[PDB]
Amino acid sequence: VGFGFIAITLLTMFINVGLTLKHTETIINKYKNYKWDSGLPTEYADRIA
């Protein structure tokens, strides 16, 4: 009963960001590629129409 007792405010947001970040799908596809070394093929396929 003997003390002053004043009221003041504080606010806490707690922003939740960091959901998702699920990396989705990772995708890679191989190549047959061409260098000047090259050399003998084994037969052929497709190649034009």
């Binding site: 000047w36 070394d37 090259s38 050399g39 003998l40 037969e43 052929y44 190649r47 034009i48």
Partner: protein, 76 residues
């Protein structure tokens, strides 16, 4: 220099063609016909082309031809 190689089967599907090996050939051409003018660059074909620019140092050096200073003003 009248010695140059035309690289292998020229046309269509085939089993004939050069082994990727060709480039070795196509490697040589650029060699030879670079050894044509080893350093050399004539102006004469372009001889008046270059210098038209102002006060041109116009290095043709070590080999090349360059210049006119065609319209002059050049103090070239």
């Amino acid at each position: 220099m009248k010695q140059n190689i035309n690289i292998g089967n020229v046309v269509d599907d085939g089993t004939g063609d050069y082994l990727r090996k060709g480039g070795i050939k196509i490697n040589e051409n650029f060699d030879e016909l670079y050894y044509e003018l080893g350093d050399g660059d004539v102006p004469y074909s372009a001889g008046a082309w270059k210098t038209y620019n102002a006060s041109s140092g116009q290095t043709l050096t070590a080999e090349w031809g360059k210049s006119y200073a065609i319209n002059t003003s050049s103090g070239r």
